[PDB]
């Protein structure tokens, strides 16, 4: 294994170092507004060295944006694909590339048997070519790497079964900035080439000047270079026809033949296209070849890519004819005139890449190496696209919940083959496809119309219910004696309890377990642990009585705590204040669950305070208190005036809070200093003159201003197992929760009718971080950031898909997230992260609406303060950072918590105590990211697929069983290493053993069973 800490990779272009050197000037470059007037040597090309030009027709089809998936399918995409089939069949020289498999699969299943055969023949002969072949073209900023792989797998599994093809070239023309997570996943999935478009106008200019727009893109930690993927970055402002022929859009627009005649379109530069004739073809070819030779000066070979398309193009038979016939008349003239020294023709993306690599092997070019990312994107002036890191944060949070439920449903159901009557495969295909659709660059981004967001939310809600049904049937099968198990596949044996989605203050839908010494004195509950190591964690349930004791199924007592149930309400006379339930209570205890396993507990009612259950105290801090009854709860609420508070659970850290209920300090141990750490809430506004913020753009009117808090009401709950401080602020109920290690932070965010406001949560410390901070990419890797005062505030905002940290020589503070949000370090010792944004104006990128559809959301975090002076850190020149053990486990507690199940009926005949006690407990840096049965019950050879991910953790001194996934299931007959999509066998494994993967590596295995 490579060492990913000590050796700094040597690359030609390192994006952090390039950013530090660049001046970012926004000069008028002439017809190429953000570049310069390109010149070429006309003697560069002759009889023996010609320019080869590939014109690649395409159509950008969004699976939801202005219309829903189904509205676009019926009104636009089914006509595009029907006309593609007819025109390519009739015109063998015509070519077309296709990206979005969600639409292609919907179309193909609706075709008659004769049309399916014709479609297969234009794919087999290479006229219709699939590019990427994902379900969608995903967002690269907010998306988790697990979901990027899920949607790639859904589309490529469909293409292999139905079209017998697997793309090796990727096409990503519309995501709002680009991540190195994509080449990481694509290179481990059989790809050879990829293309990107939306990068900062300043970066396009700097790379074009050095002919560094084609590069070998490696990971920031990769010293050897085996992660490298060949990447083509397009040079100009857009992927439309005016910005793809060459540097002058007033010329290129005249070669978009839909912008004349009866289509109702036109050229903004005021010179229309003209039909190509014998009379004009020499003059028209003179201007067009000059644009081609200028574009070719920006690249290193004699092979040139010219895309030809736009949004939902090639809808009409007449559009295919007017584009094909005028281009054919230009190609026939140009190819027949030796003075041009050009060969031009319709082609595909793979055709382009094959010809470039042939030119390279001929010794025509040697390509540069590059590491880094392409965030944050700007298309013009100070218009940085950091707004969509936060827009529609309710759905961003829902993405992470559905990610975990799909993993848990696939894993729990994989242990067995199921009868077709159970409909397990139907429910899991629905769930995978709804989560896959939401990865689209107008889904998770929050950049769709209000009615389109409602469609995404309804689809994700159906997917959640499908996962719940699979999970509960699987738990019953796994923990019921085989002598008793006799299933009704329609029946609810268990209901799921989730404390964190949507959250009891968002939707008060948790089930209360109702116990009574007569009617029903006990209830069985079951915890699942998807992680491949033993886990102990606190769990809670709602119960109808405070007098409840916990046992394991063997009747061993478990120490428990009871707390009241609290809700928060606006008083119309005055204040935001808490109200206690008189009818339900929380029971809280530590569950111990095997790796990838299950554990059963029992809740039992009694007359009075039972021997192994304690009761939290509650203190309400407010002047002029009124009474707060709590029904049977045995401890009276205490009252006081606002004051500073300190709390400690177990022998974990001591936290101190201000009179307003906000953190002010952390002490790690009894001996150590009180380290200042202050939470604050601030607000950004919108510019009254000049460019307005919208769903995409963040354009603040200066630095954030303090929120006036008044004298808010503070509630302190103190228990042996769990304590919290909760405060009612304007727009936010803010909670700090303590269970004996790093605290958990919960914000119930309701921005209400506060038009043109963005709410930010900031941390202030004396950590001497200077201009340096770290943010993650897609939940996979931490990248070093440098704050730049020469760029505006909105340019120093980055995606926070799962975490961020600052550090000096001695101390680090990490904030882990349960949802992707936008964030920064705008001053030494600070972290900040945006909670919600409400915007009255459109930002002129095509959405045609502001963001005024906000709803309450529960955001969740962990906060980890650590000493790092005894840690082996990367050298100052390394562009990556790495989490500690404690911060990594804190992230895992937010993204993949224990699942909780309540038995639905009065009696569970044949109940068992535990599943998976024999499972291997793997090293803490290893995860089983995916477990998925690949075969239905009728297959004679069963196949199960596993994705294994090993992260890299910092070594800090304080230093388990070998996991072989090929032997988790009995009767293993073969074990293969595969691409991450499971579609190609790469290696038949010695001894049917799936080996140990290296730090920062991901591998896929398939086990076959007799
Ligand atoms: Zn798009």
PDB file of C-alpha atoms in Angstrom, residues 533-639:
ATOM      1  CA  UNK A 533     -17.938  -3.673  13.972  1.00  0.00           C
ATOM      2  CA  UNK A 534     -19.523  -4.085  17.419  1.00  0.00           C
ATOM      3  CA  UNK A 535     -21.455  -0.910  18.399  1.00  0.00           C
ATOM      4  CA  UNK A 536     -22.792   0.384  21.754  1.00  0.00           C
ATOM      5  CA  UNK A 537     -25.054   3.425  21.538  1.00  0.00           C
ATOM      6  CA  UNK A 538     -27.844   5.141  23.458  1.00  0.00           C
ATOM      7  CA  UNK A 539     -31.341   4.581  21.899  1.00  0.00           C
ATOM      8  CA  UNK A 540     -34.713   6.103  22.982  1.00  0.00           C
ATOM      9  CA  UNK A 541     -38.440   5.181  22.703  1.00  0.00           C
ATOM     10  CA  UNK A 542     -41.724   6.941  23.578  1.00  0.00           C
ATOM     11  CA  UNK A 543     -43.616   5.103  26.436  1.00  0.00           C
ATOM     12  CA  UNK A 544     -47.035   5.805  28.108  1.00  0.00           C
ATOM     13  CA  UNK A 545     -45.613   5.521  31.730  1.00  0.00           C
ATOM     14  CA  UNK A 546     -42.398   6.754  33.438  1.00  0.00           C
ATOM     15  CA  UNK A 547     -42.197   3.489  35.474  1.00  0.00           C
ATOM     16  CA  UNK A 548     -40.333   1.310  32.885  1.00  0.00           C
ATOM     17  CA  UNK A 549     -37.391  -1.082  33.192  1.00  0.00           C
ATOM     18  CA  UNK A 550     -35.192  -2.536  30.398  1.00  0.00           C
ATOM     19  CA  UNK A 551     -33.875  -6.130  30.085  1.00  0.00           C
ATOM     20  CA  UNK A 552     -32.256  -8.190  27.315  1.00  0.00           C
ATOM     21  CA  UNK A 553     -34.339 -11.123  26.088  1.00  0.00           C
ATOM     22  CA  UNK A 554     -32.369 -13.299  28.625  1.00  0.00           C
ATOM     23  CA  UNK A 555     -33.820 -11.034  31.472  1.00  0.00           C
ATOM     24  CA  UNK A 556     -30.459  -9.349  32.422  1.00  0.00           C
ATOM     25  CA  UNK A 557     -31.204  -5.769  33.719  1.00  0.00           C
ATOM     26  CA  UNK A 558     -30.034  -2.776  31.568  1.00  0.00           C
ATOM     27  CA  UNK A 559     -29.408   0.690  33.206  1.00  0.00           C
ATOM     28  CA  UNK A 560     -31.984   3.195  31.764  1.00  0.00           C
ATOM     29  CA  UNK A 561     -32.957   6.894  32.095  1.00  0.00           C
ATOM     30  CA  UNK A 562     -36.442   8.459  31.733  1.00  0.00           C
ATOM     31  CA  UNK A 563     -36.824  12.100  30.499  1.00  0.00           C
ATOM     32  CA  UNK A 564     -39.984  14.107  29.776  1.00  0.00           C
ATOM     33  CA  UNK A 565     -41.215  14.865  26.210  1.00  0.00           C
ATOM     34  CA  UNK A 566     -40.882  18.629  25.422  1.00  0.00           C
ATOM     35  CA  UNK A 567     -42.240  20.779  22.497  1.00  0.00           C
ATOM     36  CA  UNK A 568     -41.625  24.502  21.730  1.00  0.00           C
ATOM     37  CA  UNK A 569     -44.366  27.132  20.985  1.00  0.00           C
ATOM     38  CA  UNK A 570     -44.636  30.884  20.082  1.00  0.00           C
ATOM     39  CA  UNK A 571     -46.663  32.911  22.716  1.00  0.00           C
ATOM     40  CA  UNK A 572     -48.741  35.484  20.729  1.00  0.00           C
ATOM     41  CA  UNK A 573     -48.967  37.869  23.809  1.00  0.00           C
ATOM     42  CA  UNK A 574     -45.195  37.860  24.539  1.00  0.00           C
ATOM     43  CA  UNK A 575     -41.586  34.534  23.695  1.00  0.00           C
ATOM     44  CA  UNK A 576     -40.666  31.009  22.336  1.00  0.00           C
ATOM     45  CA  UNK A 577     -41.264  28.633  25.315  1.00  0.00           C
ATOM     46  CA  UNK A 578     -41.361  24.859  26.081  1.00  0.00           C
ATOM     47  CA  UNK A 579     -44.413  22.729  27.052  1.00  0.00           C
ATOM     48  CA  UNK A 580     -44.135  19.326  28.807  1.00  0.00           C
ATOM     49  CA  UNK A 581     -46.190  16.231  27.809  1.00  0.00           C
ATOM     50  CA  UNK A 582     -48.438  14.818  30.603  1.00  0.00           C
ATOM     51  CA  UNK A 583     -49.050  11.529  28.622  1.00  0.00           C
ATOM     52  CA  UNK A 584     -45.709  10.314  27.099  1.00  0.00           C
ATOM     53  CA  UNK A 585     -42.067   9.947  28.307  1.00  0.00           C
ATOM     54  CA  UNK A 586     -38.673   8.942  26.755  1.00  0.00           C
ATOM     55  CA  UNK A 587     -36.920   5.728  27.976  1.00  0.00           C
ATOM     56  CA  UNK A 588     -33.164   5.818  27.135  1.00  0.00           C
ATOM     57  CA  UNK A 589     -30.619   2.948  27.361  1.00  0.00           C
ATOM     58  CA  UNK A 590     -27.386   1.568  25.820  1.00  0.00           C
ATOM     59  CA  UNK A 591     -27.904  -1.067  23.095  1.00  0.00           C
ATOM     60  CA  UNK A 592     -24.986  -3.453  22.264  1.00  0.00           C
ATOM     61  CA  UNK A 593     -25.343  -4.735  18.625  1.00  0.00           C
ATOM     62  CA  UNK A 594     -23.103  -7.187  16.678  1.00  0.00           C
ATOM     63  CA  UNK A 595     -21.352  -6.212  13.390  1.00  0.00           C
ATOM     64  CA  UNK A 596     -23.959  -6.129  10.542  1.00  0.00           C
ATOM     65  CA  UNK A 597     -26.312  -7.622  13.194  1.00  0.00           C
ATOM     66  CA  UNK A 598     -29.444  -7.442  15.447  1.00  0.00           C
ATOM     67  CA  UNK A 599     -30.114  -7.271  19.267  1.00  0.00           C
ATOM     68  CA  UNK A 600     -33.510  -7.732  21.101  1.00  0.00           C
ATOM     69  CA  UNK A 601     -34.532  -5.843  24.313  1.00  0.00           C
ATOM     70  CA  UNK A 602     -37.729  -5.851  26.452  1.00  0.00           C
ATOM     71  CA  UNK A 603     -39.496  -2.813  28.049  1.00  0.00           C
ATOM     72  CA  UNK A 604     -41.630  -3.776  31.175  1.00  0.00           C
ATOM     73  CA  UNK A 605     -44.053  -1.541  33.244  1.00  0.00           C
ATOM     74  CA  UNK A 606     -44.119  -1.429  37.143  1.00  0.00           C
ATOM     75  CA  UNK A 607     -46.115   0.354  39.995  1.00  0.00           C
ATOM     76  CA  UNK A 608     -43.272   2.762  40.979  1.00  0.00           C
ATOM     77  CA  UNK A 609     -39.586   3.812  40.346  1.00  0.00           C
ATOM     78  CA  UNK A 610     -37.891   0.512  39.285  1.00  0.00           C
ATOM     79  CA  UNK A 611     -34.426  -0.448  40.529  1.00  0.00           C
ATOM     80  CA  UNK A 612     -32.299   0.166  37.355  1.00  0.00           C
ATOM     81  CA  UNK A 613     -34.076   3.306  35.881  1.00  0.00           C
ATOM     82  CA  UNK A 614     -33.094   6.936  36.868  1.00  0.00           C
ATOM     83  CA  UNK A 615     -35.039  10.218  36.258  1.00  0.00           C
ATOM     84  CA  UNK A 616     -33.623  13.437  34.722  1.00  0.00           C
ATOM     85  CA  UNK A 617     -33.939  16.766  36.531  1.00  0.00           C
ATOM     86  CA  UNK A 618     -35.356  19.730  34.504  1.00  0.00           C
ATOM     87  CA  UNK A 619     -34.473  23.438  35.128  1.00  0.00           C
ATOM     88  CA  UNK A 620     -36.385  26.212  33.246  1.00  0.00           C
ATOM     89  CA  UNK A 621     -34.279  29.463  33.113  1.00  0.00           C
ATOM     90  CA  UNK A 622     -36.594  32.479  32.650  1.00  0.00           C
ATOM     91  CA  UNK A 623     -37.758  35.491  34.747  1.00  0.00           C
ATOM     92  CA  UNK A 624     -41.438  35.430  35.982  1.00  0.00           C
ATOM     93  CA  UNK A 625     -42.043  31.653  35.536  1.00  0.00           C
ATOM     94  CA  UNK A 626     -45.523  29.970  35.338  1.00  0.00           C
ATOM     95  CA  UNK A 627     -46.127  26.258  36.346  1.00  0.00           C
ATOM     96  CA  UNK A 628     -45.077  23.254  34.075  1.00  0.00           C
ATOM     97  CA  UNK A 629     -46.901  20.009  35.042  1.00  0.00           C
ATOM     98  CA  UNK A 630     -45.503  16.611  33.705  1.00  0.00           C
ATOM     99  CA  UNK A 631     -48.338  14.095  34.605  1.00  0.00           C
ATOM    100  CA  UNK A 632     -46.896  10.948  36.379  1.00  0.00           C
ATOM    101  CA  UNK A 633     -43.199  12.105  35.873  1.00  0.00           C
ATOM    102  CA  UNK A 634     -41.794  11.841  39.432  1.00  0.00           C
ATOM    103  CA  UNK A 635     -39.421  14.964  39.569  1.00  0.00           C
ATOM    104  CA  UNK A 636     -40.898  18.519  39.794  1.00  0.00           C
ATOM    105  CA  UNK A 637     -39.488  21.066  37.265  1.00  0.00           C
ATOM    106  CA  UNK A 638     -37.164  23.684  38.939  1.00  0.00           C
ATOM    107  CA  UNK A 639     -37.127  27.442  38.024  1.00  0.00           C
TER     108      UNK A 639
END
